[PDB]
Amino acid sequence: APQSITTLPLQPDGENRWRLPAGEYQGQFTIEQPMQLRCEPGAVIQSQGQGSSLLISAPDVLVEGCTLYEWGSDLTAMDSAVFILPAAERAQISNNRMRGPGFGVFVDGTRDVQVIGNEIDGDAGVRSQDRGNGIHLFAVSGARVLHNHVRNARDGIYIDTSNGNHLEGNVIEDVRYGVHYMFANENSLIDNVTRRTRTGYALMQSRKLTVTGNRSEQDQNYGILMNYITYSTITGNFVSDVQRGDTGGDSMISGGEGKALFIYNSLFNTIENNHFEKSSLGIHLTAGSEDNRISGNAFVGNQQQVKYVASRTQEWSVDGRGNYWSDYLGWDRNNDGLGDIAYEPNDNVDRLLWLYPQVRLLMNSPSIEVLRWVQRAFPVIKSPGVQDSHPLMKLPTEKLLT
Amino acid sequence: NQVWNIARKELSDGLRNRWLLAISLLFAVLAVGIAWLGAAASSIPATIASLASLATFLMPLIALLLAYDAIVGEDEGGTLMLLLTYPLGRGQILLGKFVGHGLILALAVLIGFGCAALAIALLVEGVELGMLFWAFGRFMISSTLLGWVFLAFAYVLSGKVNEKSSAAGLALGVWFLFVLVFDLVLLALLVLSEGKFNPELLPWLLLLNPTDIYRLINLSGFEGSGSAMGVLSLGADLPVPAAVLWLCLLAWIGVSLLLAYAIFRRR
Amino acid sequence: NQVWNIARKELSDGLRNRWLLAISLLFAVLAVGIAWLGAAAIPATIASLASLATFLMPLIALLLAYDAIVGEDEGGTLMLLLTYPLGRGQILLGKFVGHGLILALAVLIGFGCAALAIALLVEGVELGMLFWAFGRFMISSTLLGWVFLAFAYVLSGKVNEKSSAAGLALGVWFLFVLVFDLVLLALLVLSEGKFNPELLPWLLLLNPTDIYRLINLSLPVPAAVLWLCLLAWIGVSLLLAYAIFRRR
Amino acid sequence: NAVEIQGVSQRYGSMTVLHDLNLNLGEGEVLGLFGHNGAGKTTSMKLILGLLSPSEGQVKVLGRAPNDPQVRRQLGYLPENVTFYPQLSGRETLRHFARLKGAALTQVDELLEQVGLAHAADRRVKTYSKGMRQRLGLAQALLGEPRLLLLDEPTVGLDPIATQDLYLLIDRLRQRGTSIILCSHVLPGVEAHINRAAILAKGCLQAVGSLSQLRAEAGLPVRIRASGISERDSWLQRWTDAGHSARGLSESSIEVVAVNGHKLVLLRQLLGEGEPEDIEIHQPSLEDLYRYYMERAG
Amino acid sequence: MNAVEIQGVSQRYGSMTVLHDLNLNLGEGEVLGLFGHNGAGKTTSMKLILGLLSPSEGQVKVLGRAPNDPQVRRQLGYLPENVTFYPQLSGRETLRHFARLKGAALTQVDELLEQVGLAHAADRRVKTYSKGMRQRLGLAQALLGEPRLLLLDEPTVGLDPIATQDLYLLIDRLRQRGTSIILCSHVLPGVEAHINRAAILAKGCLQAVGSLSQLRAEAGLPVRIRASGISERDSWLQRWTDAGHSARGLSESSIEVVAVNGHKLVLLRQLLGEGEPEDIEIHQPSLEDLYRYYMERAG
Ligand SMILES: [Mg+2]
Incomplete structure (x- = not known):
């Protein structure tokens, strides 16, 4: 395992700035001195398939313009492409191309690391169980990972116990999980795009974080999965066409019919102005996750809007303004934005289908069509559901489809 | 009096109708069952809006089962031409049938909402007995009036027709139009226009349907949630008080009984 | 053959029934109004058309034939017809042919304008799939109607008056459409320790309204068993009606 | 009145x-x-x-x-x-x-x-x-x-x-x-x-x-039938001399359509010669009177 | 046949x-x-x-x-x-x-x-x-x-x-x-x-x-001989009572005789021979009267 000084870098400027010329290289490399090295676009630093290719151990290293290829795959010995030590504070990893079967950007114990504008193509043949993480972050405070392009890794941008960091504008395509969160209290992520993914956004046990403006295009079985998130903020997310499928490993999630949002034991969080579009389930609300501000979203095109297997009432409108529902057959007499009648998304016969799947054979029966009318006429048999007084009449998310 | 002598017949002829006593016991076993489900769920505006919807489906049904063959059932039975050769008038053998069939509906709902009150005072512990007597007294003296409307509706469609098989088609037509078509015509007019057809005329169309004036009387104090009403959430836009809603229910009797008498006078 | 000479009567007498033509127009209007709100707003609208024809095609069949046997007995023509060169089989089977071709025409005005409202309001409906999903729909709606036609012959031969025949035709319509499936749901949500829910996909075969929907929603059995179980509901209840009609 | x-x-x-x-x-x-x-x-x-x-x-x-x-x-x-x-x-x-x-x-x-x-x-x-x-x-x-x-x-x-x-x-x-x-x-x-x-x-x-x-007020024939007469061949002619048609249907079933203006001489023909068995003088009934006046009106 | x-x-x-x-x-x-x-x-x-x-x-x-x-x-x-x-x-x-x-x-x-x-x-x-x-x-x-x-x-x-x-x-x-x-x-x-x-x-x-x-x-039923003003009702009511036949005492100028139809061959000879026959009707016992007898013959 050689070092970065064992190459031939031509210095453009004498402020610890280096520039590697065009031409291929071989083997692992190690940065031990604060060198702000750039690269020409023909600098294909190709490892042989073992070890961490570009290990960084010095603080304030502005790695720029490299092109890494074929590093290791030993996930137990954590063979990354860009290994960044805890002593390597304020590292900048700008505009890089990566192709290899392990970790793309593994950082741990770092502060103010910047992972900007990279293209991390993971794998093609591995079964999405040993591909390694795209941008792995392990307990970092201050990080700024912005506008990268992760493709075909394992669980996308994995984040474990990292406190304060932003994830702005990065596109994540054909991976297992889009963005994975593990105990990342007081986090933030803006405008990310996840495409064709077995879970678009994994939000597991991370509190107080801001999830804003993110996009989930044609993901599989879980649009935004939130497990045990408290005091969070879900404003402006666009989750579109969550088809059914399975993750293949069933480690932290299970297989789903396609849920644009799955709320599991998340007590307090503001879920406003979102757009859950054309999935099988618009939102799944578990029984333990109750009394949180869910107002202003757009539930359009979903085959079933809310799944709420409970008998507790759940008002879904804070400050008198509710959500837009596509199947809301209501009117608006006094010309404000709100509807006049409340909207119950679930019947009693719409929750017998969740309890007993054999009622799907009886779902076209006239007696069910009688029982849908008996609930609309006799509200004593109506179980207390997930209604919202004053639902919206028009789309509030006129900007999120762009 | 001659108005009571033919009322005493229909009081003793309607109570031998086995189709009446089936659907008047069905009104009793559902008003107990709704008031028990309104007791097991404890709400208060949901057990009023379901009882008022129960008497919307059944008190027009008992009224139209009674009186669809009141005039034409005597005309093709031969006993109407005989009755005019008795010392009577056409106004006495109609008002007498209205008094005779009206005391059945006054007894079919005193059985129904009487046991609905006894399935609350013996079920809900600590209920307000003053509020129970007033709310279910308002259910008793207004489901008769809804019943007396459809009783007087049935005299209109009996004097006009000349065959009892076509009177049963019109009585089924009146029961379908006023109960669950006018509630759906007004709903489809509100859905397809998104409440922008007329923001001031549309609550006044509830007064052209006596089942909607009946629902607006009982849901006066116990308004509650808006989705429990449906198209009766338009009644909050009505500036008329509750006493005028009693008077428009009585005017639906007297207009459709004077129409029932003017049709029967040229039978 | 005298099975057709009495069938031409029931065509000519059934098509002038004012009660049938009101409902058959209302069946054809509501089949357009479901197809209007299913095309402008195809398995989602052919299932809502199946819930319409489970309501009304038992009601159309029971409006035709609740007074087929006992309506002729009250009219006195049944006693007259048995003194003609006519068996009791040819009167019943000839009424089943005559009333059968009425609701074989009432689905061609019912679904002939419903499939016209789908093929002309989607503009790209791919009509090769339409004429097989509606060809399976018009055939299976007649066979559902022919069950309740044969159910109406069972209750007509049993009663002695025309007024109690309509009280049973309303009772057969309530039991076989929306009381049998309500006690199937009540066997689920109120009984769970001794009610196997795997048995319930087989318990739909004891209900011809349920077998009607299962061959418009495509299940432990294949499709061909349900067609031979829908025809078995015709053949048993017609044989039951002939056994009742021979004991008058 | x-x-x-x-x-x-x-x-x-x-x-x-x-x-x-x-x-x-x-x-x-x-x-x-x-x-x-x-x-x-x-x-x-x-x-x-x-x-x-x-x-x-x-x-x-x-x-x-x-x-x-x-x-x-x-x-x-x-x-x-x-x-x-x-x-x-x-x-x-x-x-x-x-x-x-x-x-x-x-x-x-x-x-x-x-x-x-x-x-x-x-x-x-x-x-x-x-x-x-x-x-x-x-x-x-x-x-x-x-x-x-x-x-x-x-x-x-x-x-x-x-x-x-x-x-x-x-x-x-x-x-x-x-x-x-x-x-x-x-x-x-x-x-x-x-x-x-x-x-x-x-x-x-x-x-x-x-x-x-x-x-x-309406000339209608009285229908004398004399079933069981002794001789019948001259009795075909003995009533028709004054215009009373001796119409018969059996061996002796002469239902003589009379004119009700000669009831003495036709009964003297019957009772003067020949023995009867059961004479049935049928006066014009209400069926015949109704069939006269309705025919007179059209 | x-x-x-x-x-x-x-x-x-x-x-x-x-x-x-x-x-x-x-x-x-x-x-x-x-x-x-x-x-x-x-x-x-x-x-x-x-x-x-x-x-x-x-x-x-x-x-x-x-x-x-x-x-x-x-x-x-x-x-x-x-x-x-x-x-x-x-x-x-x-x-x-x-x-x-x-x-x-x-x-x-x-x-x-x-x-x-x-x-x-x-x-x-x-x-x-x-x-x-x-x-x-x-x-x-x-x-x-x-x-x-x-x-x-x-x-x-x-x-x-x-x-x-x-x-x-x-x-x-x-x-x-x-x-x-x-x-x-x-x-x-x-x-x-x-x-x-x-x-x-x-x-x-x-x-x-x-x-x-x-x-x-077979059923012995009486003949219904009706007359109207032969000579006088009171002069003719007496005659059938000695001969054993019923003479009904009608209102005025009318002689209804309910005779036993066994002697009525020569009984009509005296009825013709003393007065005018100007309104008579001898009626045999009808099918309405025969049915009234046979219902009392059994029941
Ligand atoms: Mg509004």
Whole structure:
């Protein structure tokens, strides 16, 4: 395992700035001195398939313009492409191309690391169980990972116990999980795009974080999965066409019919102005996750809007303004934005289908069509559901489809 | 009096109708069952809006089962031409049938909402007995009036027709139009226009349907949630008080009984 | 053959029934109004058309034939017809042919304008799939109607008056459409320790309204068993009606 | 003088379905209206009952107006077909009509035994035959001493033992002073009990008067048949000498169509020569008189 | 060849025998009248001639065959009482329906519509028909084909006496061809001029059968001699009381004599020989009076 000084870098400027010329290289490399090295676009630093290719151990290293290829795959010995030590504070990893079967950007114990504008193509043949993480972050405070392009890794941008960091504008395509969160209290992520993914956004046990403006295009079985998130903020997310499928490993999630949002034991969080579009389930609300501000979203095109297997009432409108529902057959007499009648998304016969799947054979029966009318006429048999007084009449998310 | 002598017949002829006593016991076993489900769920505006919807489906049904063959059932039975050769008038053998069939509906709902009150005072512990007597007294003296409307509706469609098989088609037509078509015509007019057809005329169309004036009387104090009403959430836009809603229910009797008498006078 | 000479009567007498033509127009209007709100707003609208024809095609069949046997007995023509060169089989089977071709025409005005409202309001409906999903729909709606036609012959031969025949035709319509499936749901949500829910996909075969929907929603059995179980509901209840009609 | 119809020419729909019938009915007579079941007979039936207004003419029932309540307690109307009230009983139907007509309620128990219906009293009218409902229909017609019966075909669906007992009940009321109108179509048999027939056809009242008057004002043949004569070949000719057709159908079945102007010399032909067995002098019956006047009108 | 040979039947329902030892023989051209009450004595004996019932202890031979053969029922008319046809069908289409069932030619429908007097009301619904108008339609289906046996159960109910005499003129036209028919009627005055042999039967049994000359000879019934002003009522009331006959004391100038019809050959000789016969009517005891006697002979 050689070092970065064992190459031939031509210095453009004498402020610890280096520039590697065009031409291929071989083997692992190690940065031990604060060198702000750039690269020409023909600098294909190709490892042989073992070890961490570009290990960084010095603080304030502005790695720029490299092109890494074929590093290791030993996930137990954590063979990354860009290994960044805890002593390597304020590292900048700008505009890089990566192709290899392990970790793309593994950082741990770092502060103010910047992972900007990279293209991390993971794998093609591995079964999405040993591909390694795209941008792995392990307990970092201050990080700024912005506008990268992760493709075909394992669980996308994995984040474990990292406190304060932003994830702005990065596109994540054909991976297992889009963005994975593990105990990342007081986090933030803006405008990310996840495409064709077995879970678009994994939000597991991370509190107080801001999830804003993110996009989930044609993901599989879980649009935004939130497990045990408290005091969070879900404003402006666009989750579109969550088809059914399975993750293949069933480690932290299970297989789903396609849920644009799955709320599991998340007590307090503001879920406003979102757009859950054309999935099988618009939102799944578990029984333990109750009394949180869910107002202003757009539930359009979903085959079933809310799944709420409970008998507790759940008002879904804070400050008198509710959500837009596509199947809301209501009117608006006094010309404000709100509807006049409340909207119950679930019947009693719409929750017998969740309890007993054999009622799907009886779902076209006239007696069910009688029982849908008996609930609309006799509200004593109506179980207390997930209604919202004053639902919206028009789309509030006129900007999120762009 | 001659108005009571033919009322005493229909009081003793309607109570031998086995189709009446089936659907008047069905009104009793559902008003107990709704008031028990309104007791097991404890709400208060949901057990009023379901009882008022129960008497919307059944008190027009008992009224139209009674009186669809009141005039034409005597005309093709031969006993109407005989009755005019008795010392009577056409106004006495109609008002007498209205008094005779009206005391059945006054007894079919005193059985129904009487046991609905006894399935609350013996079920809900600590209920307000003053509020129970007033709310279910308002259910008793207004489901008769809804019943007396459809009783007087049935005299209109009996004097006009000349065959009892076509009177049963019109009585089924009146029961379908006023109960669950006018509630759906007004709903489809509100859905397809998104409440922008007329923001001031549309609550006044509830007064052209006596089942909607009946629902607006009982849901006066116990308004509650808006989705429990449906198209009766338009009644909050009505500036008329509750006493005028009693008077428009009585005017639906007297207009459709004077129409029932003017049709029967040229039978 | 005298099975057709009495069938031409029931065509000519059934098509002038004012009660049938009101409902058959209302069946054809509501089949357009479901197809209007299913095309402008195809398995989602052919299932809502199946819930319409489970309501009304038992009601159309029971409006035709609740007074087929006992309506002729009250009219006195049944006693007259048995003194003609006519068996009791040819009167019943000839009424089943005559009333059968009425609701074989009432689905061609019912679904002939419903499939016209789908093929002309989607503009790209791919009509090769339409004429097989509606060809399976018009055939299976007649066979559902022919069950309740044969159910109406069972209750007509049993009663002695025309007024109690309509009280049973309303009772057969309530039991076989929306009381049998309500006690199937009540066997689920109120009984769970001794009610196997795997048995319930087989318990739909004891209900011809349920077998009607299962061959418009495509299940432990294949499709061909349900067609031979829908025809078995015709053949048993017609044989039951002939056994009742021979004991008058 | 119970029913005094004078000059009435009833118009409805500009059709003029009745014209100028002068039908005076005595205070003890049994009139018989013998029109068809069309707008000639049943319109004049509705005029006497008071449920129709006589256009261009006056109807005086019992000396007063036909729609007064004081005379309508004195009427009795047996209608055509009255399946009355199938869920009510027999006593309760008749107690209902006794309360309407002002009759005493003690008359109900002695009218369900006067008419043969005490076995079917307190039994429902749906369990009644057609003859038992005509018994009930008669029972409300005799309710509270009626001074004018009006029976519209009372002997249809009725046994001939009961039909003969009904006409004795008619003849009981004739002696009591109650005028009876028999709008009937069972014309053979009714001619022995009525006092005056009234054959009306196409609105115009064709003939009125007693049975002796209808045979006097209309030349009809008397039908003498002499079954069982000794010699028959000369008896083909011995009656036809004065224009009486000796028509026969058997060995001796000469039903001689006479002229009713030579009844002495034809019977002297029969009783002077030849022995008979069972002569049957058949006077022109009410069937033949109705078939004359309807044929005379068209 | 006798048409109906009811040969000792005994029809029972449960333990009760509603028809016991009935023994009829209707001829080849006779018009027989099954007279009796409307209960199960007559209306089950009407069904054994049809194919509706079976003789429980005997046999019936309709046209020399069993009553339920298809060759029998193509030549067997039957007008039932209280018939109400299909009211939405028309009058011509009802006969066109019934002609196809009996195998009659369709050119006989418009012939029989004119024959019964239904030419004006053809192509009109049966609901807009009168009671007697449907009896003309019910008679017209009985004449379909060439029937050899008619069971006219009450044909003249609700019919005018022009149409009633038109019906019996069709009866005497039919029985000349060889169509032996059966009356089951209740209007007993009027039928006796066309009934070939009455068949008055009680609750269970068959009381009397035979012609009108045979019923009057067996059942001793008195002749109803009526006169009007021969000489004087009071001078003639005394004469029958010594001779043993009943002289009814009528109101004025009218002599009604209820005589015992055994001496009335020479009793009418003295009645003619002393006064004018200007209004007399000697009536033999009618079928209404014969049925009144035979109901008291059993019951
Ligand atoms: Mg609003």
